[PDB]
Amino acid sequence: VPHKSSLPEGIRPGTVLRIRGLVPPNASRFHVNLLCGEEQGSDAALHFNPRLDTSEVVFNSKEQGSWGREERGPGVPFQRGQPFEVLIIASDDGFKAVVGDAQYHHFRHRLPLARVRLVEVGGDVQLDSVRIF
Amino acid sequence: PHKSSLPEGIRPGTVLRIRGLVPPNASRFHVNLLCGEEQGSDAALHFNPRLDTSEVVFNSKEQGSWGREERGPGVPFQRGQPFEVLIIASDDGFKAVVGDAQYHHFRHRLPLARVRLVEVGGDVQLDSVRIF
Ligand SMILES: OC[C@H]1O[C@@H](O)[C@H](O)[C@@H](O)[C@H]1O
Ligand SMILES: OC[C@H]1O[C@@H](O)[C@H](O)[C@@H](O)[C@H]1O
């Protein structure tokens, strides 16, 4: 299910994205994108890409159709056949990624938080819910 | 009377996650964000679910006196039931989330930078209190 949540007014420091779901057996990878528009090729303030097939999580941004330098977190905190809960929290200096009870990584802002207009979740994941507080 | 200290306070983006159960014969419990360890210290936020009178009260305490009470819509808590609460600090206030929904937005009355301690007390069965 390619999930999309529209955020007309954008987000601000103090915004929390909570994503719950299940990593199916044989999943290769999935992603959570914070995009700056609803069209194809829109800039991505955040590309959060857990890769079960290569065992790592990649963070990146996309601007003018071109990717920035990837950041990687300490191992993959997801497992095939197991549910998970991810909190992506917007702060003044970056996005904190919390995976089930522990801070996993901090991704410093590359694009203005104010330009984020859409959240998309896709890939090999079976979503329970996506809530924005 | 669970106390979790926050040296270097909290800022926009700080998230408080509280998990526990409301005892079967619970009257009320509270979550306080205080500006000091000493008793009677100022409270930037007082979140007080009252199961006896069926109302959730929000308030602050400055120089010993309670401020103007604010109430959320109804009581999202039930006796004998487990719960998860998120208190999110932003630039304009604290967002209280109960379950899967935003319950109330309490706008700042005291400086966020004066927040030094979190306290959870009253009739509540605490599972965990995590700060992100
Ligand atoms: O840097 C992030 C990008 O890395 C590429 O290797 C991948 O094909 C893209 O889908 C995206 O994940
Ligand atoms: O308004 C907040 C305060 O209200 C009082 O009536 C109560 O005794 C205090 O414990 C606190 O809840």
Curated annotation (Swiss-Prot), chain A:
UniProt cross-references to InterPro entries, sorted A to Z: ConA-like_dom_sf, Galectin-like, Galectin_CRD
Primary localization class, coarse: cytoplasm
Binding site for a beta-D-galactoside: 67-73
SUPFAM superfamilies: Concanavalin A-like lectins/glucanases
Superkingdom in the source lineage: Eukaryota
CDD domains per the UniProt record, alphabetical: GLECT
Pfam family, one: Gal-bind_lectin
Stated induction or repression of this protein's expression: By p53/TP53.
SMART domains, A to Z: Gal-bind_lectin (SM00908), GLECT (SM00276)
Entry comment describing in which tissues the protein is expressed: Mainly expressed in stratified squamous epithelium.
Gene Ontology BP annotations: apoptotic process; heterophilic cell-cell adhesion via plasma membrane cell adhesion molecules
Domain Galectin: 3-133
Compartment(s) where it occurs, according to its Swiss-Prot or TrEMBL record: Cytoplasm; Nucleus; Secreted
One Gene Ontology molecular-function label: carbohydrate binding
Keywords tagged on the record: Apoptosis, Cytoplasm, Lectin, Nucleus, Secreted
CC annotations in GO: cytoplasm; extracellular exosome; extracellular space; nucleus
Signal sequence, start to end: none
Function according to Swiss-Prot or TrEMBL: Could be involved in cell-cell and/or cell-matrix interactions necessary for normal growth control. Pro-apoptotic protein that functions intracellularly upstream of JNK activation and cytochrome c release.
Quaternary assembly: Monomer.
Name of this chain's protein: Galectin-7
Protein's organism: Homo sapiens (Human)
